[PDB]
């Protein structure tokens, strides 16, 4: 502990240029959610599990949400990370303390139904969505059958 304790104090106080390092404490790390796949989307009949972390400064900062169930989507990556305006920090992002967990989950449900070509987290899936939509839908349906449904 002597090294680590002192090491951490040196990083807190005299870090290298462009670098900072601190401790956080989440309010809650064991919250989970489930979203049903929507009618008239390739995720229909699938059930999708998610992780919801409530960070230290909620509701001033947004919940931190990743998909646990795999999903084939241009805005959702191999690690389940999600690109969405209401999940991004103010002032540039759309999160505010006048929204809540329910509204962000409803926004993720909407995203599943309305993928956004301008916000790629998965460049290959985004390219397929743009230039060969029938192939994208086939793949999205198969992944839903394999990993969700």
């Amino acid at each position: 502990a002597s090294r680590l304790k002192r090491e951490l104090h040196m990083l807190a106080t005299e870090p290298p240029p462009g670098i900072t390092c601190w401790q956080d404490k989440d309010q809650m790390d064991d919250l989970r959610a489930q979203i049903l796949g929507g009618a008239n989307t390739p995720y229909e009949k699938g059930v999708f599990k998610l992780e919801v972390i409530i960070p230290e400064r909620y509701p001033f900062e947004p919940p931190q949400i990743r998909f646990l169930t795999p999903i084939y989507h241009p805005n959702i990556d191999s690690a389940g990370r999600i690109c969405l305006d209401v999940l991004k920090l103010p002032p540039k992002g759309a999160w505010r303390p006048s929204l809540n967990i329910a509204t962000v989950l409803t926004s993720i449900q909407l995203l599943m139904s309305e993928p956004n070509p301008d916000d790629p987290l998965m460049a290959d899936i985004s390219s397929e969505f743009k230039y060969n939509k029938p192939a994208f839908l086939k793949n999205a349906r198969q992944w839903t059958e394999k990993h969700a449904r």
Copy 2:
């Protein structure tokens, strides 16, 4: 502060249509495993670390297992998630309470020796496995050398 408790009550009793939100309590979250790379597989020289999480209603739901070590394989992704029948619920999947941690780890070891081309979690890797096999095997050997600890 008190908001969150109230918020969760409201999510629990009256959620949005198609959405549910609840609290999980894992039986154990710090359990680890290690699988030695198999003979006559491209993973031979490596050792592979995994995390094993035991959920609240085990053994009625399967263990939640992810590779911590990077591995180049069509059925395993960058988060270490694993597409395998014994890790999925019936009727589609093969989990039942007559299986256990030891048997599912053995099943994952067999999956490492026998990849499945129809169960993809990484699109480029699956395609390459089926259509450009020599490139797959070269990449799998190189990833073992560069990103796994050597045996």
Copy 3:
């Protein structure tokens, strides 16, 4: 609970061949870091968050570090995992106890400025970096604006 303890006993005493289990005892898991995007790189004006885990055997094994903020780079994957010599053990790697958390964070910052096409975790990005650099720089800039920029 009784079932789980019985299983852990059996795994400790008579595991399947090639497979072992144990419980990790990390020194620390709640440490966070931040790297400012470097001047004269495509990551300029981005702010990048990272997770730092300090394992049981630090400083004789390296710290375990990944990006939480998405970044477009040949040596960093979709889960934020980082391919870098000082994060790996010898003989293949360069971690030694004379290094520390601060120097490794500085090495990650240097890696951002100087990608390494020998060690690709992202094959498509590595090819773009080698053969179509203006397109690499343009895409790295766009990803920075979309996922890492705060004003």
